[PDB]
Amino acid sequence: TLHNIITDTENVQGSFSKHEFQAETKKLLDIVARSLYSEKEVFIRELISNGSDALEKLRHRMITAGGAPMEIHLQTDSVKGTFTIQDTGVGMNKEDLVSNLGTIARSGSKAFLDALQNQAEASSSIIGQFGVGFYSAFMVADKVEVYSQSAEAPGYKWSSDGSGVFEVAEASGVRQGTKIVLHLKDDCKEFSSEDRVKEVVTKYSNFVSFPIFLNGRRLNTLQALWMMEPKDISEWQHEEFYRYVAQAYDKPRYTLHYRADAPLNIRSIFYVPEMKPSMFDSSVALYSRKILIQTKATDILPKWLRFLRGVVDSEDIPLNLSRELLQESALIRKLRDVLQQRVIRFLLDQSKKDPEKYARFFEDYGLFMREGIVTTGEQSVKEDIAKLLRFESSALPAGQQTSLMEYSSRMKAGTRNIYYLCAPNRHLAEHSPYFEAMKQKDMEVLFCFEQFDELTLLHLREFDRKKLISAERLSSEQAEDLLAWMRNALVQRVTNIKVTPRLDTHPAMITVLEMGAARHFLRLQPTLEINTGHDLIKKLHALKDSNPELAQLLLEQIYDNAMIAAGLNEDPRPMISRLNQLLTRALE
Amino acid sequence: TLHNIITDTENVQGSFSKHEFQAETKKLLDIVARSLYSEKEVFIRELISNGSDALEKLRHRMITTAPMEIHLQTDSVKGTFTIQDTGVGMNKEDLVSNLGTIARSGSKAFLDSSSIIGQFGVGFYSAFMVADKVEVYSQSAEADAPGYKWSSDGSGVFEVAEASGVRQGTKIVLHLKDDCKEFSSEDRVKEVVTKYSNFVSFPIFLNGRRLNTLQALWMMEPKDISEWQHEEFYRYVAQAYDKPRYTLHYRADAPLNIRSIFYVPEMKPSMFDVSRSVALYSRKILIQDILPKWLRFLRGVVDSEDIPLNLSRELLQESALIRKLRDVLQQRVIRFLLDQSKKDPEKYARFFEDYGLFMREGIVTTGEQSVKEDIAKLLRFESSALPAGQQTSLMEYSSRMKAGTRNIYYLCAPNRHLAEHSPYFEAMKQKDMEVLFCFEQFDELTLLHLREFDRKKLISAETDIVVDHYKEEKFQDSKPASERLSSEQAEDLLAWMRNALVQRVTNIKVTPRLDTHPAMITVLEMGAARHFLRTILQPTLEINTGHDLIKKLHALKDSNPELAQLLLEQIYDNAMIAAGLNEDPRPMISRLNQLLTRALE
Ligand SMILES: Nc1ncnc2c1ncn2[C@@H]1O[C@H](COP(=O)(O)OP(=O)(O)OP(=O)(O)O)[C@@H](O)[C@H]1O
Ligand SMILES: Nc1ncnc2c1ncn2[C@@H]1O[C@H](COP(=O)(O)OP(=O)(O)OP(=O)(O)O)[C@@H](O)[C@H]1O
C-alpha cells in the first residue's frame, strides 16, 4: 500500500566539468537594500556601527603608533531631505574604498579582528562581521556619497545610486575620517527629521562607547552598566538603569549582576520590579557588543522567568544576518540552562539573607514558579524550582512559611511521603475530614492556600526522590428538635447539620469534605455544626415555636455568619438587607 | 553651545573612475549556510517550495498528464535526506546558471501565476546548513536534452556530469553532516513538512506514505466552506478538540490584501492561559503583533500579499502596515462581533460571559478614545427601564436619552436584586434618569477608563449622589414628617453619632433619599475607592430619619447607651459592606453575634 519513486537508478555517464559559484551582483544589492531587515530605520544602526568600528580601529592604531578626538557626527536637512553621518576614525584610502564598499560580503573590520590578539580591547568591540551592512543606505536613499580621508600620508569621493555601479574621484578638503551623505527617498523623508532620527539612535545605538552628536547636541549620555565591575556600581546607578532598560518608574527589589566567561561571554544584569504586575499592562533585552539585537529576548531565558527585567550581552553569540535574530546553536540552549540555575541559586540566597523580603517576593511573583514546574518537562528542573516554593504547615502556627526542603527535614526517619492538603483558607484546612485522619496517626501536612497550588504539586509528582500524596445547656432531645427544624428551613443550602463541642464563642461553623469542591464554589456540600451551649442557639430553640418568623431570620444569619467566618462568603452584600430586618425585629 | 563638525567643504578634484560592484562568493555561501536562517529545519521548506515551483512550471506547460508529486526519503543508516519532484527539471545550462549563481532565480524570468514561491534566488543553498555533500540529478522536459548530475561540497566549486536513468524531474540527495542527524528521521522530517509545507498544492510522499496535506481555506470562497470544514480546520491551526462557536472568513482587497479566517473556541478560556495565537502564511507557506493584545483569544490564519518577507522568510518588513493591518482587522472583528449580537443575542450573552474579560482589557489598556468606544460597543449591561434579565448596550442607552440629558448613569452591584434595591438606586429613582446595571467584577474599572461614550460622560450612581449635595438638595423624604424624627431629635442624634465615630467618618448628615435602608456611605470617587481597596478614606454617613432602625437608635442612646453604640457600629459596618468598601468581613462577625445576643434579650 506504499508508493515511492526514489530509486538508485542514476549512474555517472562520461566526464564532468568544473565551475565556481557565481553571484548576480545587481540582484544581490537589491536583496541587502530591501529584503534583509524588518525595519527601514535599521540603516541608522549600521552606519553608526560602521563608524564605531572606524573609531575603534584608530584607537587601536594609536596604542603602538600613537600620534583630534573620535566620536561620530550626524546632521539632518529637512529641506533637501538628506541624512549625513561623519566619523573621525581611521578613514579609507582609495584602495579600501573600492575593496570594501565595492565588494559585497567583504568586511575589512572582520579581517581586522582576525589579526588582533584575543586579549586586545578592540577584539571585543568591533561590530562588523558579514560585509553587507553598509548597503542598507540604498534602502532609504536614491544617492549615496561617501567622503573619506585616510590616516596615512588625499581624500576621495565614493558616489553611487544603488544600481550596480559607483564612481571614485579625488576630493578636497575631506576631514580625517569618513563622511556619508544620504539623499533620502520620498517615502523616507521622515529620516530628515531631528526627532525621528533621535528616536532611532536611542533604540539601537544608545550604548555606543563614543559620543554621538545630532546637529551639534550629544545624545547617548547613558553608559552600559553590564560591562563594568559589579562593585564599582552604586545602588542609585542600578535604580536609574532599571527605569530605562525596563521602561518602568519604580525601584528594582532584586538585582543580579552576572558575569561569566564559560559559555561564550555573559555580561548581564537582571532586575525584579518592586511593583506587582497585573492585568492593566517590556522584558529582558538582548545586546551584542553594546548594540541592541532584541528588545524582548526569546531564546536565552525560559518562559517562567519572563518576569525578570534587564539586559543580556554576549560578544560571541551567533548572530543572524539581520542582526535582530539569533542562530540555532547548542551554545544558546546551554546558556538558557546556566541562567536558569543562576536565577534559582540567586533567589535562594535572598530567602536566607532576608526571609521577610523573600516572603513579599513570593506573594507577588509566586505564580511564575508554579507556572514553571508545570510547563517544563524535565524532572530535575521541577525540583530545582520547587526549592523556591513556600507553604504553610499543619505543625506550624498560621502566617508562617516553609519550603519543601524544610518539610523533608522534619519528617519521621521511617517515612518518605510528602503529604499536602490544598484548601482555600485555614479554617477549611484545619476542619477537613481528610486532615483529621492525618492529625491522629500520621503527622505533618502542608497547607497550600494559593491559587494553582494543587496541579503544581500534581505536576511536581516527585521531590527529593520522594512522593507527594494529597491527603484526600441544651439537652440531648432539645437539640434534636432544633436540628429537625434547621434541616427543613435549610433544605437546599447545606447537606448535613451536625452538633460538635468545638465552638464555644461561635454559635456555628462551616466545614467542607472535599477542598476541590470548595474552590469550585469560590469560583458545594457544607456541614453546619451547632454548639448546644451558645446563647444564640438556645434562643433559636426557644423562638422556633414562639416566634417562627423571627427565628427564621436568626437561623439565616447564623448560617451566613458561619459562611463568612469560614471564608466561603467574602462579599456579604446580599445579607445586608435581611440583617437590618433582623435587628429591627430584635429591638422591639 | 553647539559642537558640529559637518560642513559643506568638499569639492571634486579631477575626473572620476567608473567601477562595478562585486561580491565575495566564497563568503556569501558561508553567510547563507551559517548566518542566514535562524533554524536549520527550514532547508526542507526551501527544497519543497523549489519542487512546487518546478511542478507549477510543468502545470503551465502541460497546457500548450504525467504524475506531479514530491517524494521525500530518509536513510538513518546512511544519514541521507533525498527529495525528488517530477517537475520541469533543469538542462545543463539551467544547472549552471540557476544553481551555480547566487541570487539568480529562474522562477523570475519564467514570468510572462501567483503560485510560484521562488523569488530571491538563494533558497537552494539552504541545504548546506545540514549537508556536507549535495547531489542533484535533473532531466529537462520532452526536448533535446540528456540527464545530468550536479555535485558540490559547498566550498566554491561544483561539477556537472551527464547521467543516465534520470527520471523526469529533479532529485536532490543531501548527505547530512553529523551535526544534523535529526533530519534522517521519518518522524522529525514529518514535523518540518506539516509545519511549513502543509498546504502545498501537490502531493508529498515520505518514505512511500502520502502526507495528509491540507487545503488553504483562507484562499477560497467563504460560501463554499461548510460548517464541518471549519471544524476540522480550526482543530488544526488551533490544535484543539472542540468546535468554534463563531467563524469569520474575512477577505479584502482595499486598502490592503487580506485573506484571513478567525475562530472563537466554544471552550471557556482557561484562567491559567490568560495570564500566561493566530498563524501567518504567505503563498501557503508558514511565516513567523498582527492582532491587538485583547484579541489573543481568536485563532486562525492571516494572509496578505502586501506584507514583504525578508531573505530568511521569517520576518515582516512593514511595521507601519502591520500597525495598519492590525487596526483594520480590529474594526472588522468589532463589526463581526456586533453582528453576532443582532442575529443571536442569547448566544452572544454566552460569548460575552466567557470572553468579556478580553473586551474589558482592550478598553483599559488603550490610549485612543475612539478605540475605547469601539470596543465598548461590545459590552452588555441591564437597564432600570427594562425587565430583569434583558441585556442592553451603550448604543441602546444613548437612543433612549432625552434631548436635555447629557450623562450616562450606571450602577454596579453583584446581581439584579441588589441593584434594584440598592440604597444608591433609591436615591436615583427620585430622578427620571435611566441607570445601567453592571454585574461583573471589573465593570466599574472598565467604565472608569472608558470615561465617556459618544460625547456623553459616564457617571456612577454613587458619584452623582455626592454631586447633588453641592447643588440644590431639592428632594423630599419617602415618608411624611409624622413618620420621621424631628429636627431637634435629629441634631441630638447626629451629635451623638459624630462622637462615637470620630476617626472613622469625615461627617454624618441626614438624607431624604432613602426608603428601605437606614444608612448609606457616599464617597465622591467611589469607583476609584473600590479599586484602591483591591490591594482610611473620607467617607460620609447618610442616615434616614424615617427608618425604624434609626428612630430606635435615637431612643437607645438614652435607654441602653452601650447597646446603642454597638448598633451604631453595626449600622456603619453594614453601610460600608453595601458600599463595597468593607475590609475583612470576618472580625465584624464577633460584634454582630454579641449584638444579636443583647438584642434578643
Ligand atoms: N565610516 C567608515 N569609516 C571607515 N571605514 C568604513 C566605514 N564604513 C565602512 N567602512 C569599511 O567598509 C567595510 C564594509 O563594511 P560593511 O558595512 O559592508 O560590513 P561590516 O560593517 O564590516 O559588517 P556588517 O556587514 O555585519 O555590518 C568595513 O569592513 C569597514 O572597514
Ligand atoms: N527541483 C527543481 N527542479 C527544477 N528547477 C529547479 C529546482 N529547484 C530549483 N530550480 C530552479 O533553479 C533556480 C534556483 O533557485 P533557488 O532555489 O536557488 O532560489 P529561489 O527559490 O529562486 O529563490 P527563493 O528561494 O529566495 O524564493 C530556481 O529559480 C528554479 O527555477
Numbering used by the authors:
A (entry chain A): 85 to 151, 154 to 239, 242 to 369, 376 to 566, 588 to 638, 653 to 717
B (entry chain B): 85 to 148, 153 to 200, 209 to 372, 377 to 388, 393 to 639, 652 to 717
Task: Give the published text.
Heat-shock protein 90 (Hsp90) is a highly conserved ATP-dependent molecular chaperone. Hsp90 is a V-shaped homodimer, with each protomer consisting of three major domains: a C-terminal dimerization domain (CTD); a middle domain (MD), which has been linked to client binding; and an N-terminal ATPase domain (NTD). Most higher eukaryotic cells possess four Hsp90 homologs: two cytosolic isoforms, one of which is constitutively expressed while the other is induced by heat shock and stress (Hsp90β and Hsp90α, respectively), one localized to the endoplasmic reticulum (Grp94) and one localized to the mitochondria (TRAP1). Using TRAP1 as a model system for Hsp90, here we investigate how ATP hydrolysis is coupled to its conformational asymmetry and propose a model connecting it to client remodeling.
To directly test the ability of the hemi-hydrolyzed dimer to exit the closed state, a FRET experiment was designed to look at the kinetics of dimer opening after ATP hydrolysis starting from a synchronized closed state population. This is possible because TRAP1 accumulates in the closed state upon addition of ATP in absence of Mg2+, whereupon hydrolysis can be initiated by addition of excess MgCl2. Wild-type zTRAP1 protein at 5 mg/mL in 50 mM HEPES pH 7.5, 50 mM KCl and 1 mM TCEP was incubated with 10 mM ATP and 10 mM EDTA for 1 hr at RT to allow TRAP1 closure before setting 2 µL hanging drops by mixing 1:1 with crystallization condition consisting of 0.2 M Na/K tartrate, 19% (v/v) PEG3350 and 36 mM hexammine cobalt. To differentiate between these possibilities, we took advantage of the fact that our crystals grow overnight, allowing collection and freezing of crystals every 24 hr for a time-resolved experiment. After screening crystals from multiple time points for diffraction quality, two additional datasets were collected (1-day and 53-day-old crystals), solved and refined through the same methods to resolutions of 3.5 Å and 2.2 Å, respectively. Similar to the 3-day-old crystal, no significant conformational differences were observed and no Mg2+ ion density was present in the ATP-binding pocket. However, electron densities for the ATP molecules showed a monotonic progression from an ATP-ATP structure (one day old crystal) through an ATP-ADP intermediate (3-day-old crystal) to an ADP-ADP structure (53-day-old crystal), clearly demonstrating that hydrolysis is occurring in the crystal. The fortuitous ability of the Mg2+-free closed state to be crystallized with ATP allowed the slow hydrolysis process to be examined crystallographically using crystals of different ages, revealing that the buckled protomer hydrolyzes ATP first while the straight protomer is still bound to an intact ATP. Ramachandran statistics for the refined zTRAP1 1-day structure are 94.6% favored, 5% allowed, 0.3% outlier.
